[PDB]
Design a protein around this ligand. Structure first.
Ligand SMILES: [Zn+2]
Ligand SMILES: [Zn+2]
Lengths: 91, 96, 56, 251, 77
RNA sequence: AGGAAACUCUGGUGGAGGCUCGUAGCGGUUCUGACGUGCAAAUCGAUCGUCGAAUUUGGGUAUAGGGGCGAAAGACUAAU
RNA sequence: UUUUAUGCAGGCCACCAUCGAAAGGGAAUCCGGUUAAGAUUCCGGAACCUGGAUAUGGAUUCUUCACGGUAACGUAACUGAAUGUGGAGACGUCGGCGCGAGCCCUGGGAGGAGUUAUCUUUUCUUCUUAACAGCUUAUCACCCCGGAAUUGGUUUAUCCG
RNA sequence: CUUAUUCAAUGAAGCGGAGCUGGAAUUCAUUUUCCACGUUCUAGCAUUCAAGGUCCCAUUCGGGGCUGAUCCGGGUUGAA
């Protein structure tokens, strides 16, 4: 049915550790347990093996990344600015 | 645009999806054109390029993924490749 | 176990193909294709380079 | 009185880092000929968790140009690398992720990691999770590059000093809590025997310079001169200010 | 300790010339309720293994022992 | 299943937790019980704590005396 | 060099000692019986590996270093130095699911024993088959065909195309 | 300034200089100097003093030198 109002995956942690830390942990546990999309194949077979090891079962690939998400926004900015200055330099 | 012309071909012309049926058609020469996704194995990509070089067929690279091309043709699964055998109605063969 | 591999004969240890008991057959396929394709690519790259810089 | 904890950590019998589950050092290939006259290709074959570290590593493979062999290296993975990947490393290489262009070659506003400090130390700067170094400017005549370090520090280092392009992986790690002495236990037991930390003010005065008293109180101020000694350097050392800071690092 | 079916194989085995000993076992057996038969078992012994030629025909068994050499030391049981 | 939609609920599966009851086990609260020239140079009994782990443990191995080790009692370092 | 040593024509390579676990890794054995006291160690039988000589048979070849199969791959074998590459060794913990072994429960029948004033086609008991060898057998995986929305297959657990 | 001292690598491999071969340079006379001086769609592969070309040998089973791979100095390379 509907089990939990707002603890979600942080109901295994029970009544411990404080609501705020449980909120943060909730957010990041969702991020890290979720399935993502392998860019090489588009399929939803991407998962964490370990912190910044994000591997795809279907296409048998592995990409390095954030401990809890697979693409961190900082590194996204870095990709973009790298492409920018590289285009400029070859240009 | 391109997805509109491809839907027109889905309605009027005929086609076959996927690497195996595609390259079978290309071996037979019956095909005219291929559209190829951009998420794609570069090996498969280059092999198709060679096959189409031999067949003198045309090739087009899709600014999209398997998902996007599938939505374009109107199917609901992954399509890295599509082979146009004839369009009848569309300007696909003429344009690009 | 390894010493038992040393007991048995060749038939029980590998396959009649190139890369018999080392690599998957599908991987054999893949890498053969890779070789042929990119050496052809190398060749056409070489000749286009030669002719454009010969013009130039 | 008695010898104290740091004063034993120097000798290091039980405080040596643990090593069983590490793949060895992560290092940059030697600046031999190619990386200072051209470039070389390598294949990222796999990516692997290293224990005790927080980042992952990249098992990369090059070919020794002098001998028919395949020389393997362990790199740090930046975010955006993957398996089966072609990593071009050297001077005449390309400005993408994974590559090892010199700081003399890269432009301003650039991001790098695993940066050398002097050419042939093979990875010193910004090796930990999510830490990057930014380029500032050059003085190619008397070849030097200004770089900003995650402490905000503007350092000046040579130009042949290599450095990997990208941001180090495993970011966001300390954004998560731990919630558990057990989680911290596991962390520090794969790193080194550094936990739990017990308070000197709860120790006895023989065992620390805070210990003792009918009330847990320090008594004598904890701001310690830099020119103190081994036995006195418990507390805040060479400190300029204390307390809550409100405002800016101001640099 | 290997089964054997080919009779000429068993004979050239008897003349393998490392072979020295042989045995013939009889066994009381059942094909069906009313014909409990007589299984013959020629167990020949050389060096590295024992070869067991199996037989379920007394006519063939007597022809076999008629065919065997005399010098090969036998054990009837 | 409901709802105009937003989105809400119901039954099931499933089997998480430094969760819990509780045996083995590790411990050692209370009885301030027994004994207290003992079975014992620290035990016996009942009652108790905890029991998948920051767990318990063998073996090897390192740290040696103003030194070591210490989740810290000035505790332990062969009844010291 | 066949006076001979290993000088000697040649090229290769590059630990950089050693010690360290009778519970980690590890080449190879099982049954039966046997003594006052031994046993996987003895006896009988049947096996396995290692090392080294090694001869017969067999296979290959006058197209010199095998053939069949679309393929996955198969076979009694069926050249292969230097060097290099890969794999096994070699690996957590918990859950439940399946499968197997032995045990337990049990039916019939063949023997033996017990009870029996009464009743009990009854209670108990034996009915076994090792290492090793040959033939055969499998979940997962993999190949051929063919081309899937009307979406389908499928696990206890929802994953796949 | 490097040599003394000090730091670090490395199986002490490509140092430095000059030079070809090209691009730019304005050559104000001939080059004035500067850039390069074999590699980038792809998880392949790269080894036998290198094949070739070339000069010899004793052709024979083959054997050897130059180039292929510019030359000189023998400061391993940087730092300080
Ligand atoms: Zn994928
Ligand atoms: Zn494979």
């Amino acid at each position: 049915a509907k089990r939990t109002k707002k603890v979600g995956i942080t109901g295994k942690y029970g009544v411990r550790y404080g609501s705020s830390l449980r909120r943060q942990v909730k957010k990041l546990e969702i991020q890290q347990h979720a399935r993502y999309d392998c860019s090489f194949c588009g399929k939803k077979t991407v998962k964490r093996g370990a912190a910044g090891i994000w591997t795809c079962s279907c296409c048998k690939k592995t990409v390095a990344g954030g401990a809890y998400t697979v693409s961190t926004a900082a590194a996204a900015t870095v990709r973009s600015t790298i492409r920018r200055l590289r285009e400029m330099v070859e240009a | 645009s391109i997805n509109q012309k491809l839907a027109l071909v889905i309605k009027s012309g005929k086609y076959t999806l996927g690497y195996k049926s595609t390259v079978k058609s290309l071996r037979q020469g019956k095909s005219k054109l291929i559209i190829i996704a951009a998420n794609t194995p570069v090996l498969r990509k280059s092999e198709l390029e060679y096959y189409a070089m031999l067949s003198k067929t045309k090739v087009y690279y899709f600014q999209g993924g398997n998902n996007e091309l599938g939505t374009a043709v109107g199917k609901l699964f992954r399509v890295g490749v599509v082979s146009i055998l004839e369009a009848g109605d569309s300007d696909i063969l003429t344009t690009l | 176990r390894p010493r038992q591999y040393a007991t048995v004969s060749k038939t029980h240890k590998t396959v009649s193909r190139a890369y018999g008991g080392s690599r998957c057959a599908n991987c054999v396929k893949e890498r053969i294709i890779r070789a042929f394709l990119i050496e052809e690519q190398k060749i056409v790259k070489k000749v286009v380079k030669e002719q454009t810089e010969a013009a130039k | 009185g008695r010898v104290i904890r740091n004063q034993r950590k120097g000798a290091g019998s039980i405080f040596t880092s643990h090593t069983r589950l590490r793949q060895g050092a992560a290092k940059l290939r030697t600046l031999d000929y190619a990386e200072r006259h051209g470039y070389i290709r390598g294949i990222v074959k796999q990516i692997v968790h290293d224990s005790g570290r927080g980042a992952p590593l990249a098992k990369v493979v090059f070919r020794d140009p002098y001998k028919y062999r395949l020389r393997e290296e362990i790199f740090i993975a930046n975010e955006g690398v993957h398996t089966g990947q072609f990593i071009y490393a050297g001077k005449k290489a390309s400005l993408n992720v994974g590559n090892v262009l010199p700081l003399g070659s890269v432009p301003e506003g650039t991001i790098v990691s695993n940066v050398e400090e002097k050419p042939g130390d093979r990875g010193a700067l910004a090796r930990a999770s999510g830490n990057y170094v930014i380029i500032i400017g050059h003085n190619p005549d008397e070849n030097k590059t200004r770089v900003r370090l995650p402490s905000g520090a503007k350092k000046v280092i040579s130009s042949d000093a290599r450095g990997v392009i990208g941001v180090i992986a495993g970011g966001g790690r300390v954004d998560k809590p731990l919630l558990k002495a057990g989680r911290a236990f596991h962390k520090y037991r794969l790193k080194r025997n550094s936990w739990p930390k017990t308070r000197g003010v709860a120790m006895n005065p023989v065992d620390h310079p805070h210990g003792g008293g009918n009330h847990q109180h320090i008594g004598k101020a904890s701001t310690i001169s830099r020119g103190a000694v081994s036995g006195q350097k418990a507390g805040l050392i060479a400190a300029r200010r204390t307390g809550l800071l409100r405002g800016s690092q101001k640099t | 300790a290997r089964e054997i079916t080919d009779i000429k194989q068993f004979l050239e085995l008897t003349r393998r010339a490392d072979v020295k000993t042989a045995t013939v076992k009889i066994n009381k057996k059942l094909n069906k309720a009313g014909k409990p038969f007589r299984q013959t078992k020629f167990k020949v012994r050389g060096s590295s293994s024992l070869y067991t030629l199996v037989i379920n025909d007394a006519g063939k068994a007597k022809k076999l022992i008629q065919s065997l050499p005399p010098t090969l030391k036998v054990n009837r049981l």
